[PDB]
């Protein structure tokens, strides 16, 4: 466990956090290149900073998954249009096949490399994540994740897992000559 009511509020209330999360969400949406009014899964939705933008920028309907109760409780006061769900993404994506047009995830999936919460390998959770994500996406559905890798082995493990699950696509790295400001986007599509 990582967050609490205090820290979830200070995160969601920080103007600098809001601005950066908003920018990367907009960038993720640019990379997703969706039709408006699509049906979207927001993975690691936190308090809904990314989700609000789905609503406002693309007129999308969305469901949000997050493992933290205090992040979600903070989201409840923000007048969101999305459905928030208390959920552990490493256990799978609990929607029937072909539900979503797309999935988005801002600053969340690097947590799948962490082996604290549960007693499956991160390797197993990673695989569970991508196999069930692939299934819950419509054919040709897209997934874009902005994420924070600790090193290049995490990157290539994530890429490998997504590859074996059926995804194709690649890595976009913005401002890569600034390891203070560079950002990694996983950009995928299903079969």
């Amino acid at each position: 466990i990582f967050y609490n009511d205090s820290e979830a509020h200070k995160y969601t209330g920080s103007t600098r956090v809001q601005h950066i999360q908003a920018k990367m969400t907009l960038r993720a949406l640019e990379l997703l290149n969706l039709q408006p009014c699509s049906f979207i899964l927001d993975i690691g939705c936190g308090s809904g900073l990314s989700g609000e933008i789905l609503t406002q920028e693309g007129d999308h309907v969305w469901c949000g998954l997050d493992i933290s109760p205090s992040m979600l409780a903070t989201g409840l006061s923000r007048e969101l249009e999305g459905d928030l769900m208390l959920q552990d993404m490493g256990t799978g994506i609990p929607f029937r096949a072909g539900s979503f047009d797309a999935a988005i995830s801002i600053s969340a999936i690097q947590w799948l490399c962490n082996a604290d919460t549960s007693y499956n390998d991160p390797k197993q959770r990673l695989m569970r994540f991508f196999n069930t994500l692939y299934a819950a996406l419509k054919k040709g559905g897209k997934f874009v994740a902005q994420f924070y890798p600790k090193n290049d082995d995490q990157v290539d493990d994530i890429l490998q897992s997504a590859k074996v699950a059926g995804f194709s696509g690649g890595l976009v790295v913005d401002d890569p000559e600034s390891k203070k400001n560079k950002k990694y986007y996983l950009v995928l599509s299903s079969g």
């Binding site: 049906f39 469901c63 007693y119």
Partner: protein, 134 residues
């Protein structure tokens, strides 16, 4: 949790992956407290985009569980674009919007028809965390 969501949410336990009965979940009409929310503006484009995906039998099942048996037995059909919509189409899309997007469960519970696992909804939010062995 919106009624629409009940049309896509299945059981989380891994064993139920290949079961016909992992979906829809079984919503307890005794416990479920409904709310109607006019804040979500009518969105006909979204409805046209989602309607083919919608599982109409599961819509009927969950509606019945929740007190509503006034729905048509077959899934509404529509032309392919907003500009071909008739006055009748638009009336029917409005009702779908109300049913699917503006109606939600605030408090309640639902269970997997296959494994019996029970899930709880509090403050409109489903708890989908499972114990390690599931």
């Amino acid at each position: 949790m919106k009624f629409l969501t009940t049309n896509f949410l299945k059981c989380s336990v891994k064993a139920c992956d290949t079961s016909n009965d992992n979906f829809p979940l079984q919503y307890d009409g005794s416990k479920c407290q409904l709310v109607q929310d006019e804040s979500i503006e009518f969105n006909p484009e979204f409805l046209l985009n989602i309607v083919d995906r919608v599982d109409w039998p599961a819509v009927l099942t969950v509606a019945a569980e929740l007190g509503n048996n006034a729905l048509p037995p077959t899934k509404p059909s529509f032309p392919s674009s907003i500009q071909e919509l008739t006055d009748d189409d638009m009336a029917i899309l409005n009702d779908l919007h109300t049913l699917l997007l503006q109606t939600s469960i605030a408090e309640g519970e639902m269970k997997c028809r296959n494994c019996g696992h029970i899930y709880y909804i509090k403050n409109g939010i489903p708890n989908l965390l499972l114990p390690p062995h599931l």
